[PDB]
Design a protein around this ligand. Structure first.
Ligand SMILES: [Zn+2]
Ligand SMILES: [Zn+2]
Length: 108
DNA sequence: TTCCTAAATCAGAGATAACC
DNA sequence: AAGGTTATCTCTGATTTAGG
């Protein structure tokens, strides 16, 4: 009622408790999964917080540089350096890796 | 307590324009 | 000189947070 856990995954919380063939408790997810696939529900740890992880290195999807004064994003939604972004939004074509310049230039 | 609000802060898209 | 790449500037929107 309160100290029960899913015997397959160990989840202590669930929308609706279910029973396996042997009468033990399965969380809704696991229970449904078994009646569907006749196989235990595989445990698969959650993915990246898209931050506490993700932002652990950022290189442009096009030229793969790691530095830029401003990160933009391509259609696909991935980050791209300022240069590659501006170039594509002007020519609707990717910036040729033959343009990668040495270091970073400043102005004014 | 929890909710809601405010306002900072953050993130980028555009604009502007500096330098080769 | 004029052009073209793309640093910066300007904001609009989305997040993040301290309070009440
Ligand atoms: Zn389970
Ligand atoms: Zn790039």
């Amino acid at each position: 009622h309160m100290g029960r856990e899913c015997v397959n995954c160990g989840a202590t919380s669930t929308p609706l408790w279910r029973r396996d063939g042997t009468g033990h408790y399965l969380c809704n997810a696991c229970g449904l999964y078994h009646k569907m696939n006749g196989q235990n529900r595989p445990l698969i740890k959650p993915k990246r917080r898209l931050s506490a992880a993700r932002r652990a290195g950022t290189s442009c999807a096009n030229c793969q540089t790691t530095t830029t004064t401003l990160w933009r994003r391509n259609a696909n939604g991935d980050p791209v350096c300022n240069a590659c972004g501006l170039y594509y939004k002007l020519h609707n074509i990717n910036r040729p890796l033959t343009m990668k310049k040495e270091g970073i230039q400043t102005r004014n």
